[PDB]
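Students often ask why we bother predicting the structure of a whole assembly rather than each chain alone. The short answer is interfaces. A chain on its own may look different once its partners are present, and contacts between molecules only exist in the joint model. In this exercise we take ten input lines together and write out one structure for the complete complex. Read the inputs first and try to guess which parts will touch.
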Amino acid sequence: AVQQRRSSKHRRDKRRSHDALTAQALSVCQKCGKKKLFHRVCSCGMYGDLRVKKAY
Amino acid sequence: KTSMLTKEQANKRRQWYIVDAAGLVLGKLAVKAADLIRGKNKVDFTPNQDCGDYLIIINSDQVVLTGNKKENEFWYHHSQYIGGIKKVSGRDMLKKQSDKLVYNAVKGMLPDNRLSRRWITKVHVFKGDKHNMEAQKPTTLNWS
Amino acid sequence: MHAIVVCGSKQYLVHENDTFFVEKLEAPVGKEIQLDKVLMLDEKIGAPYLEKARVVCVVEKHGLQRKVNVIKHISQKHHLKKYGHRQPYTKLKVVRFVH
Amino acid sequence: TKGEVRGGGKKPYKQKHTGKARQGSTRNPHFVGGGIVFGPKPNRNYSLKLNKKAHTAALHTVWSEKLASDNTHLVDQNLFNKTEGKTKVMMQFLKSAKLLDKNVLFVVNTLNTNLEQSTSNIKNVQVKHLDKVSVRDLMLANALLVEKEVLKALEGKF
Amino acid sequence: LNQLKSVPKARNHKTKTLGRGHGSGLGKTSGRGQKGQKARKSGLTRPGF
Amino acid sequence: MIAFAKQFRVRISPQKARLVCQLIVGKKTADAQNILSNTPKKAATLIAKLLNSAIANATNNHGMNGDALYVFECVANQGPSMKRTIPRAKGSSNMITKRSSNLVVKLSDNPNERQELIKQQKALVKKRVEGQQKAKMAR
Amino acid sequence: MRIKGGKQTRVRRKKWLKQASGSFGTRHASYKVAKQTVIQAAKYAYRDRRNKKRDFRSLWILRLNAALREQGMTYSVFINLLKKHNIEINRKVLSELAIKEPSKFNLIVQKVKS
RNA sequence: GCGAAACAGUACCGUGAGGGAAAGGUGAAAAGAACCCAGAGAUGGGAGUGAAAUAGAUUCUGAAACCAUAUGCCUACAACGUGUCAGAGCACAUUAAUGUGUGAUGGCGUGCGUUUUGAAGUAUGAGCCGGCGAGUUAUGAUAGCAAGCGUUAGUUAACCA
RNA sequence: UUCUCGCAGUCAGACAGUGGGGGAUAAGCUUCAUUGUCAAGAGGGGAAGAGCCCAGAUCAUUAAAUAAGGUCCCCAAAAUA
RNA sequence: UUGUGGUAGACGAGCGUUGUAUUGGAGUUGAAGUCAAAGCGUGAGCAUUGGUGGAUCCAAUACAAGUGAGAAUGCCGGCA
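Now the answer. The structure tokens for the assembled complex follow.
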């Protein structure tokens, strides 16, 4: 159908509160200087001791 | 201009009270309970705070009723359903339930504000007197 | 303690030595006013009133009540009128008592 | 004005099946672009008729009223020609005559050569003739230098 | 009367409002009701007929 | 406070932008960088340059700790916006408002930059009443 | 000759939209809804100027009768007892205020006894 | 104010007749942001200048609606024009105030104007905000008021100073 | 309240007590005659209810006692036999 | 003393703003604007102070309004 009225700003904010994106994970990567997401690529682009891919 | 009307702000008094409804007429008991809850007998209550006190009942299922009134005002309770009615009768609550019976008999007899929601949690009805609640120092009386 | 005062049109059962605001009688600010009329004083209630007993009032300031903007608006008509009521208030307290 | 129509005298909108205003003309008094129905009409007369004798009485009244002022000292042709065409003398006169902060008017029937050339270099005084001056410079000046020569001519106005 | 204290002599009179506010009283009502020809544009047709 | 980052009229949905930079609000640089590095979107690669600029200003031209401060507030506001139309059915066109926004992020070393605002309002109140009383002693 | 009154009108409009306060969402930032809610609040206050009077009078009498019943007597009988003999000026609000006063309402009750 | 403070009847639409857009404000003086930094660039920041940099080019002033951010307050049992009066709680002192910020909750609570036989209306129309928008005026007359001037009044037309 | 003068505006009324007709002495139907309410005017009772009852209200003021109407209780509030 | 219920309808009392003319000054030693505020009037209102602000402004006195803005699915400087 079609609308009847406009929704307030706070109603919209509440609506978009749960319209957010999902969360992620944290994991210390052995072959890198920083952490990463569990079973993903790190800031150094390696899951761990095994390198997975190139950079350029 | 102002007579400085008194109402104890931030004060929600609660005193232990208990009754043994065995000579009270069911409606007389209900009107006395409504009087106690709203405060037609309270003299220093405050409406914007919690107006209820500690309220306890003894023998909530065997209140005496004079004349042909045990089965003369039957209790319906419908809802947003369609035909979803299970009308319950006076003979039923004698053995089915008494807490909901007295709660309805006082709520339809009182304001239906949100205060009753936290008033009912302060009401402790019992079909006997062996309950541990009597250890809470309640004053035994009647005609509340 | 207690004392009964009928100020202007209204009646007030108040305590001893309390400052209260009533409709303005233009009672003098700082100079004392006697009223032989009194009830419920000195823990004693006389039959009509108390005799040889007084309420002894004094005003510390005759201020003006805030802007009482009373507006009459009629639904689905063209009657929208406003008026500013500014009531002076007797801010007065009772000091001494005889019985 | 709405009489001026840029283009056809047609409707920008309609009444049925048109969710816009009722405007059946390109310009309307409410439309900001133009089309005022009640505007600044130039037909206004800007003139009110007053009686000749009424106006002469009014002139007499204002002359008498501002004769009573302080800086209205009696004047004549003699001191119109006594002063020179050079503005020096009349500023040295007015500054010492205290006609600066005032709006002093010279009541004149000579069109004096000294007055006409000067009095544009003075931010304080002005020159006007009998039949060339009204209640404006008579009264708003609050002190007008009346002339001894204009006496009898002014009397005849009644 | 110099134009710093001049006052009129009943030359201007009371000013009512027909297009000034909804609260003055007899404002948007146009002063001739709000129905019929007497209260609309190009109103008041020949009254002798 | 200082070294705040501003970008003008960047084309991005307000929803995705507000989400991806509110994932950074209240956090430091590295702890938020390593959590934004896994975002499957096309907004971090654009946003991170302003933060990099601000932090490099802090390192070279301001010389603060850098890690002491954190992203106090990101706002993607209703600035200039885009509208692109495409011909479609019935002879009409469908217009989509390709949202754009003036992005700005403010970095703070403390919960201030919002506390100091209420403090400024109250100081304004106090100097206002000082002036009003100076008028009220000059009666 | 244009008469450009814009500052006064702009200030009036800005204060009109800013007048609405304490309200949620898109309710305190639009002139028409703000004016409608102001009309509602004005009607609320005008009705209250007597509704609160009546409610507080009923409350006076309610706590008055509460103290009377805890004293063992009722307001009809109370006014009977004052009117018949020992009349006092202890009005409804005064009677209610006397209860919170320590045992002072009971003094009135025992005095108004014939 | 001319549609046009103008690179305006221009761009542009329409085959053609025919139409048809509006504009702004640097600083005394470019000193239009030295120096440096982040990305490949944008832009931003320090950075000084400049009286002053929301004057740093959104460059005299720099709003509102709208969009989001949040100091203190409330916050996960509650039927809605979210308000008014009373007022907690929590935190505090001012256009110096029967004090302030919210308002736990009670008392009281069918939007604005037209149709109106009655409209809260579930008739109506307004998304919103900031400006504007509708008994005005000339002539002549009725009334009302004020005024003039003489009892053959008042008064001037064209033309004239 | 007589009269002069300026301006009107209205002839969509609705309901109720009283005479009622028409219709089916049914109609939130018509209709006049008198009065009352809304209209053209609040409020109190009627749970809310335009018209029923009281009632005609500058406003404010936490003063009071009565009308309609309520006092077993929501819902101010009583008993007697 | 009437009052004060009011639609229609008439009548009473007046007010902000632009400019005309009178009349005063303030003026970077700080004006408008703009914002904010625990002021003052039967009412249109009088404003005050403080912040940006860096050149004009504010009181009438009467005048004349392109003078007052919520409605007409109005129009326009911007956005839900």
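Check your guess against this: Residues 1-144 of chain B form one domain.
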